[PDB]
């Protein structure tokens, strides 16, 4: 029941049925970034897939529709006019999950066409001996925000197609970027610069989807290497990117980052899941799960009236969709 009503009271809060979009936050003066919007839409998804109440997932299944509804007519359906390599992809992502709950071939479309798009003209030998570049206008990086979810969209669309040319991609990309934006003890790196090298920033959506790419890899290829890898970046983050009482950092004032907790939760449920039906890692499973449940009531206890978490965790006017979207997240794992 928390996952419903947390849902609930952000789509009360911050759903605009009319541009069928998400509000940026709780003055309704704006709607979200294109980029955060399709982590809106997951997080739609993801309570899709956690409720069982039959009218609420009908509702959500139909939001799922109306998100890319609204976004489309803002931004139309061909989204490779946007410089950001990173952007096409995280819409990419969300259209081959939306393609597995609806069936509808528009979202396949969109998935496949703009999958290819990145990966096919956007990959690079050369420039640190591999990886896709951030942009599509100036190719000056190669990131973790690009790297990671694109080996993850090629897993979904593996999944969907079985066509080993996703798996392929997914491998080669995945291997990549454990070699050039990790310290090979789970520490994930911002991003590869030219003329400069690696920017060994951690954050925490691309812990997250470094942790995700890694469990979907263990998944279809069976490697006990890749859920080893897994481990190490949740370890990491656990340790690393917590204050002195292990709840997650707030990682604001930068937009982007200020909601990334959303991204990192939703890969830490896979990794959850995968170490209860396996049972590998028992020792740690047991610590993690300890401290995620931690983190989540800490979250909850700031939660306001209208049943609203603020990004900021540790601690108590506007409230923005991106930061308040963690919260209802952890709760719909
Ligand atoms: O420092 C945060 C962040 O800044 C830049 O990316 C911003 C967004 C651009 N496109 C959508 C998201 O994927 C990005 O967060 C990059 O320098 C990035 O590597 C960095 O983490």
Same mark, same amino acid.
């Given at each position: 029941?928390?996952?419903?009503? +947390?849902?609930? +009271?952000?789509?009360?809060?911050?759903?605009?049925?009319?541009?069928?979009?998400?509000?940026?936050?709780?003055?309704?003066?704006?709607?979200?970034?294109?980029?955060?919007?399709?982590?809106?839409?997951?997080?739609?998804?993801?309570?899709?897939?956690?409720?069982?109440?039959?009218?609420?997932?009908?509702? %959500? @299944?139909?939001? /799922?529709?109306?998100?890319?509804?609204?976004?489309? =007519? *803002?931004?139309?359906? #061909?989204?490779?006019?946007?410089?950001?390599? #990173? #952007? /096409?992809?995280?819409? =990419?992502?969300?259209?081959?999950?939306?393609?597995?709950?609806?069936?509808?071939?528009?979202? %396949?479309? +969109?998935?496949?066409?703009?999958?290819?798009?990145?990966? #096919?003209?956007?990959?690079?030998?050369?420039? &640190?001996?591999?990886? /896709?570049?951030?942009? !599509?206008?100036?190719?000056?990086?190669?990131?973790?925000?690009?790297?990671?979810?694109?080996?993850? &969209?090629?897993?979904?669309?593996?999944?969907?197609?079985?066509?080993?040319?996703?798996?392929?991609?997914?491998? *080669?990309?995945?291997?990549?970027?454990?070699?050039?934006?990790?310290?090979?003890?789970?520490?994930?790196?911002?991003? /590869?610069?030219?003329?400069?090298?690696?920017?060994?920033?951690?954050?925490?959506?691309?812990?997250?989807?470094?942790?995700?790419?890694?469990?979907?890899?263990?998944?279809?290829?069976? !490697? +006990?290497?890749?859920?080893?890898?897994?481990? @190490?970046? =949740?370890?990491?983050?656990?340790?690393?990117?917590?204050?002195?009482?292990?709840?997650?950092?707030?990682?604001?004032? !930068?937009?982007?980052? *200020?909601?990334? @907790?959303?991204?990192?939760?939703?890969?830490?449920?896979?990794?959850? @899941?995968?170490?209860?039906?396996?049972?590998?890692?028992?020792?740690?499973?047991?610590?993690?799960?300890?401290?995620? &449940?931690?983190?989540?009531?800490?979250?909850?206890?700031?939660?306001?009236?209208?049943?609203?978490?603020?990004?900021?965790?540790?601690?108590?006017?506007?409230?923005?969709?991106?930061?308040?979207?963690?919260?209802?997240?952890?709760? !719909?794992?």
């Amino acid at each position: 029941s928390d996952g419903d009503t +947390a849902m609930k +009271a952000f789509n009360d809060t911050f759903w605009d049925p009319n541009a069928k979009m998400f509000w940026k936050d709780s003055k309704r003066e704006k709607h979200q970034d294109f980029w955060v919007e399709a982590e809106l839409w997951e997080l739609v998804m993801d309570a899709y897939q956690h409720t069982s109440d039959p009218a609420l997932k009908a509702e %959500l @299944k139909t939001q /799922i529709d109306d998100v890319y509804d609204g976004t489309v =007519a *803002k931004y139309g359906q #061909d989204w490779t006019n946007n410089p950001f390599n #990173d #952007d /096409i992809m995280w819409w =990419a992502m969300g259209s081959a999950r939306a393609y597995q709950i609806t069936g509808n071939p528009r979202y %396949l479309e +969109a998935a496949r066409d703009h999958f290819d798009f990145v990966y #096919d003209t956007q990959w690079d030998e050369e420039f &640190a001996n591999g990886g /896709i570049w951030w942009l !599509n206008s100036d190719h000056n990086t190669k990131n973790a925000c690009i790297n990671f979810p694109a080996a993850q &969209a090629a897993l979904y669309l593996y999944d969907i197609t079985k066509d080993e040319h996703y798996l392929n991609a997914a491998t *080669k990309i995945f291997r990549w970027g454990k070699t050039m934006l990790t310290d090979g003890n789970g520490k994930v790196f911002d991003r /590869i610069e030219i003329e400069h090298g690696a920017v060994p920033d951690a954050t925490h959506y691309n812990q997250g989807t470094y942790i995700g790419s890694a469990v979907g890899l263990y998944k279809a290829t069976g !490697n +006990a290497v890749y859920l080893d890898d897994a481990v @190490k970046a =949740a370890k990491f983050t656990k340790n690393h990117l917590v204050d002195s009482n292990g709840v997650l950092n707030y990682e604001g004032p !930068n937009g982007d980052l *200020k909601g990334g @907790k959303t991204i990192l939760m939703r890969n830490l449920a896979h990794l959850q @899941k995968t170490l209860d039906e396996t049972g590998q890692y028992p020792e740690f499973s047991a610590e993690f799960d300890e401290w995620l &449940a931690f983190n989540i009531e800490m979250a909850w206890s700031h939660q306001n009236s209208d049943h609203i978490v603020d990004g900021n965790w540790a601690g108590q006017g506007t409230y923005e969709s991106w930061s308040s979207a963690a919260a209802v997240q952890a709760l !719909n794992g």
